[model samples]
Target: AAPYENLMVPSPSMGRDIPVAFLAGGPHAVYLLDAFNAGPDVSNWVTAGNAMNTLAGKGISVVAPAGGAYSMYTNWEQDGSKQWDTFLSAELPDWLAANRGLAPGGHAAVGAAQGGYGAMALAAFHPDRFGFAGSMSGFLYPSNTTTNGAIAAGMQQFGGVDTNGMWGAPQLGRWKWHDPWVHASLLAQNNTRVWVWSPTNPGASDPAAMIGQAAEAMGNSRMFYNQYRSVGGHNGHFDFPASGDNGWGSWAPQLGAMSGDIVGAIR
Candidate 1:
């Protein structure tokens, strides 16, 4: 969608070809994507964030899978047929190895917004798969009532999906397993390198919408940042004053820095 080499990765897990935006080719790669935007906009996020050229310049391949905007990159039980977790964790990597010669060696995940949650979840669930993981302006705490509500609302607003279909209703106790805040210890337990970032101190010049967005990013990331440190996780967080509300403007600089960190983490 954005001058990317579009590929349809067939997923035996999901019984379909997952639309993906592939950037560059290498044995090492960073799997990154966008927020809870529509389908096409997901690839645009990679372009707008300059992730494709930037990371590839460092000799690191990058991929932005067109996983459904509201999928949260998780298996949706209520949907009864959407199994994103398996698609990413199992099928995608294997497919990359056989089809693209990008084996799972020194792999890292970097994602923004909902993609951030997906990245962290991937690393946490399969810590051995990723050497490092980073989340930019991502929603980290899924168990919090306000956090969960905002997430559900944003998905409906942008992607026309519901959390009830994601992990199921709140009372089902499905969210905990997927909550980065809840499973953060798993990263530490596995000795996975981690980084989380958000803008600090919303300023007046920022858009009214961005001010609130910045606060949410700061608050949620800070919550996990503190928890990750308190538990002695191998992690770091940046509170850049220059980081604006959100989007490519706020995320590009951070993505540049975070990609370097990912490169550093490899081997």
Candidate 2:
């Protein structure tokens, strides 16, 4: 069996104990975030994609936390019920280091779908902690049309929680701060590499206007290197070549290879 330490890290900001699965063998560590419909126990990274087995012996540790379904992993400015940004950037790194003896340096962050946005945001916000980031089918929004309303609607329907309690009214400031299109420039400014990807035929993943929206979102990001599944790009930037689906199938294979392209230069 894989050596996995399942533990609960207390989040004073969110006022709860968050579940995290950690593999403590490697030197540099990578944080794997969950999707919108995140599970309550283990992350989809384990249940769906064999991140544990795939990323094994990569000289990098793995960290995945469960919960935060429907949340973009942003600090909810309305009710503050979900202060995910604070918990991740402020509490998690310190707790992970002190508790697991994990190195608190420039680590890697990877996210799927909703988590994709957070992974990028985390690297931008905490450049001191996260050196590289990878966005896997990340639902990015270039304009306000794909912003708060849709996300909040999903929050209400998926998580069965308050909608307005997230970023507030139809138009807002806090929302923009969290938008990848708006904040992506920060990653470029810091020269912190970010790899953003989306499926060529997104309909395999979701229907309707997702493809266009994804294109808009992808275009906003800098240094895009897309090759679908194989031999993507450099500076941690590129795209896939018409990967049928827009989910883990695209990245699951690469997570195993765990090359410099996916892992990046970590200290």
Candidate 3:
């Protein structure tokens, strides 16, 4: 059987058929999310992160959907149709089970930058659905004033998209509502496994992600997971290195290292 399949699952939330890359190996699924620069043709995880080689026979289904370039992968308040939270938490899983002959539960997420924020937030919002969540150089708290400006600029560079529309200008604390740290307690209550990693400086060859620009934010952001830890949740946390890692280089290696744990947890 072919290990990889491209499926255009109809998404009720976005009111469109979203392209999803399916690695047909196991009954349960692990989601690999994209960054702010997600390609329209295919997932960066598959093409750049070597997902097919790393996860194809790992015995757990894998999904890496293309699209959502400027999207944080969360439901947009300004765009009602962009209910990605609902789609991934409910619709997509259901569709995968019924149409793809997959089992439900043990679902997990691993995402990069904007995607990382979305993955962590999704786990917090739907702990019953996602057992594990990992963030690779993600923006954990865009509500902070310093991050808001850089994120705003990053969004513009990725596309002309407006952050105000996505999370409402960061000052309104709408970003807080989407903050994984804000909902860490919920993840703890569900005993969700959380993993976090980031660097304080760009790689010698890496371009900056909006989150990368705020490297200190991630380094000093231990409080984001403190509440989760206080309640007896465990996390895989890495120290912020001075340089040598950033962008795709950082994400693919960690994805490779964690694929086993991620797939097994989802199983």
Candidate 4:
């Protein structure tokens, strides 16, 4: 029984190690990511800790990385600074396997909202590192898909940085690669399992209806689901008012079901 610990894993790109918490579960582990506006290495610890326990109890490991707030999943263009993908797919995994001997399906990626979007993007770009990914109230659409007003608003939030600092303006930059809808078909083509979650409420702060809008923008759900499910593999999405002032009791069960055998695997 290995004890859970929070850590900072270094990335050569940033010249400073990123903060990440490691929860030991035999040799396999899941990586947890934080939400928007939440402090780096902080916010959502309650829900994340619950997830950690769930994984550990099941003999699974978990890791949560801390990038600066509002970074989304995009690497900052201003300085080419946000290397989260590199940290997770390359640096962090090496750290785990070297430090804990975790191998293969032993590792998974999970996060909510911003983190959820990050998890999906990470899996698509680097399938070899992430066998499975789950997003809670996820924001799977690409930065380009988000409305222009929203992009400017985000830019303002980032102290007047351009939209590309977070991501490009609608189809402008790597938006094609970052948006889950764009790469969803890739997940299906490549046989990577995706667990996407979004709220039903459109106007609600949580993605709710907005998520469908993103998916619909791409085309139809059947095509979207089929792309990944076309083969015999598994992939699906779930929605719940699990987080965001709803409290941990509800989210714990949801996380448990996914991380545990409740869902079986990916389906």
- Candidate with maximal lDDT: 3
- Where model 4 places Cα greater than 4 Å from the true spot, the runs are 1-3, 46-49, 104-106, 143-152, 158-161, 169-173, 202-234, 237-253, 261-267
* Tens-place lDDT digits, model 2, residues 197-216: 66564443432212223443
Backbone atom clashes (below 3 Å) for every candidate? 0, 11, 1, 12
Ranking by lDDT: 3, 1, 2, 4
What candidate 3 gets wrong by more than 4 Å, as runs, is 1-3, 203-217, 220-227, 230-232, 235-239
TM-score of each: 0.87, 0.84, 0.89, 0.76
> What lDDT tens digits, residue by residue, belong to model 1 across residues 1-267?
235678888877666777887876567778875665625535645656776666665766777787556677688887744787887787888888888888665688877777777788888888766777788777777666677776666567655677788877877788888988888788878887788766665432322222234455556787888888777785564454554656667677777777667877763
lDDT of 3 at 66: 82
Candidate 1 or 2, higher lDDT? 1
* Model 4 C-alpha RMSD to native: 4.9
Residue 58 displacement (Å), model 1: 1.7
Best by TM-score: 3
Reference-based lDDT, each prediction: 0.71, 0.67, 0.74, 0.56
